[PDB]
């Protein structure tokens, strides 16, 4: 029943600031050191910051030191990450995590086993909150057909699709024929282009004999630009 819930993520211009929160439940918060760890799109985990149970000791990764500030409120059982001077490379899902065991302030007295705060591995992680740092402006996608042809047909099966190009920010949703057609559909992960705009493709394979007897429409929804496109894909 231990749970961590992050919030505060969003789309941010480089150089600007954002504050993340992590509200926790079902454990004595002040007894636990807490962590922030991030995960860039398609990448591994990267530790960002740590704070002792009593908030007297903090540590940062080299990549964020001087830009981020970790703090906690032991009255409200909330952990914070203030993210300043944001860079594009800060784009990531940010997760709160709890040290797997309690650990308190050092005893510089009555023993000498450690004169520093002790940190160990995390057990529970939150679902995370996404921070996307970009100079891009909101932009609706262009939806281009990937037309079926001889170059996409073999043995009575044709491939066709849509290219959902040049949009910002994520996400877009794509379906075929109002979501009724899912068999043979592959919708690929979006890629971020050098322009700073995303692009993604969705394809489907169907009988080539059906190209004249069946309508294939890709339904594209990009909520941030309020764009809804229903693109009919036909042989050229």
């Amino acid at each position: 029943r231990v749970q961590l819930v992050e919030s505060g993520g969003g789309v941010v211009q480089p150089g600007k600031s954002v504050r993340l929160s992590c509200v926790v439940s079902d454990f004595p918060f002040s007894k636990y050191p807490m962590y922030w760890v991030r995960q860039a799109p398609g990448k591994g985990l990267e530790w960002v910051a740590a704070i002792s149970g009593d908030a007297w000791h903090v540590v940062y990764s080299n990549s964020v030191q001087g830009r981020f500030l970790v703090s906690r409120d032991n009255v409200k059982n909330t952990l914070y990450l203030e993210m300043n001077s944001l860079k594009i490379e800060d784009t990531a899902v940010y997760r709160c995590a709890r040290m797997f065991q309690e650990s308190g302030p050092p005893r510089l007295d009555r023993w000498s086993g450690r004169n520093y705060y002790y940190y160990s591995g995390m057990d529970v992680w939150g679902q995370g909150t996404t921070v996307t740092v970009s100079s891009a402006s909101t932009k609706g996608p262009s939806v281009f057909p990937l037309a079926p042809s001889s170059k996409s047909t073999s043995g009575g099966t044709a491939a066709l699709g849509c290219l959902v190009k040049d949009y910002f920010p994520e996400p877009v949703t794509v379906s075929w024929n109002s979501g009724a057609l899912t068999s043979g559909v592959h919708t690929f992960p979006a890629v971020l282009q050098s322009s700073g705009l995303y692009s993604l493709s969705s394809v489907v394979t169907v009988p080539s004999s059906s190209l004249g007897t069946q309508t294939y429409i890709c339904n594209v929804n990009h909520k941030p630009s309020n764009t809804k496109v229903d693109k009919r894909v036909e042989p050229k």
């Binding site: 962590y35 760890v37 591994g44 985990l45 990267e46 530790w47 740590a50 540590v59 990764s61 080299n62 997760r95 797997f100 086993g113 450690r114 940190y119 160990s120 591995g121 995390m122 057990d123 529970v124 992680w125 939150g126 679902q127 995370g128 262009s142 281009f144 057909p145 990937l146 037309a147 042809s149 170059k151 996409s152 073999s154 491939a159 699709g161 290219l163 190009k165 592959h186 919708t187 690929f188 992960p189 979006a190 890629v191 282009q193 692009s199 993604l200 493709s201 394809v203 394979t205 050229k236």
Partner: protein, 218 residues
């Protein structure tokens, strides 16, 4: 920093079969208190990481004894004695001996199946796009296994660099295959400069690399 070197980078497993992932640290993770600060996490697609094993060899509550962690100093292993199909995903080691906390590069575990060659399709840019001033050419590799594939673009036989991007679907839950899309992007002016657009595909399911191509305007 303590650097974590995790191997292998990818592992295809047969269900019911054992599996081993290794982690080497750039220095000893043994602490003064006698514990060794090495942790194993798993992350399924779309999910947050979950702790499997703490301090080298201790299973986190709820984790079955299929998972066995071993090692000391700089050398560690996580073994799955029998592999079930639900174990697919990314596994990461982590150390907390010193700051920064550091993770291994990860191991992607997928399900092994028989080799399946990709069906390869090519798509010229639409007239609509050309009107806007850019041309995207798309190559689709459909339903293949294993994941390892090489896709290169040739334009009038000239190898393309720096103007393509690809992405790949998650392993299919029904047939265990992958699909991949590669997009070559050029300005309209550049697209109009050349004639033949070709996608060259190398995959172990294919006896020789396959090339799909078209002539611009046809």
């Amino acid at each position: 920093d303590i650097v974590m070197t995790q191997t292998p980078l990818s592992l295809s497993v047969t269900p019911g079969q054992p599996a081993s992932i290794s982690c080497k640290s750039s220095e000893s993770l043994r602490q003064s208190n006698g514990k060794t600060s090495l942790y194993w996490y798993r992350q399924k697609p779309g999910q947050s990481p979950q702790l499997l094993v703490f301090e080298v060899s201790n299973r986190f509550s709820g984790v079955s004894d299929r998972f066995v962690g071993s090692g000391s100093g700089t050398d560690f292993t996580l073994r799955i004695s029998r592999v079930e199909a639900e174990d697919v995903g990314f596994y990461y080691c982590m150390q907390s001996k010193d700051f920064p906390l550091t993770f291994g590069g990860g191991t992607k575990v997928d399900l092994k199946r028989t080799v399946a060659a990709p069906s390869v399709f090519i798509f010229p840019p639409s007239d609509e796009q050309l009107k806007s001033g850019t041309a995207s050419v798309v190559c689709l590799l459909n339903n293949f296994y294993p994941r390892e594939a090489k896709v290169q673009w040739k334009v009038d036989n000239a190898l393309q660099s720096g103007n393509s991007q690809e992405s790949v679907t998650e392993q299919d839950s029904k047939d265990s295959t992958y699909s991949l899309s590669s997009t070559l992007t050029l300005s309209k002016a550049d697209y109009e400069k050349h004639k033949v657009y070709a996608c060259e595909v190398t995959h172990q399911g294919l006896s020789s690399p396959v090339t799909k191509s078209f002539n611009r305007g046809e």
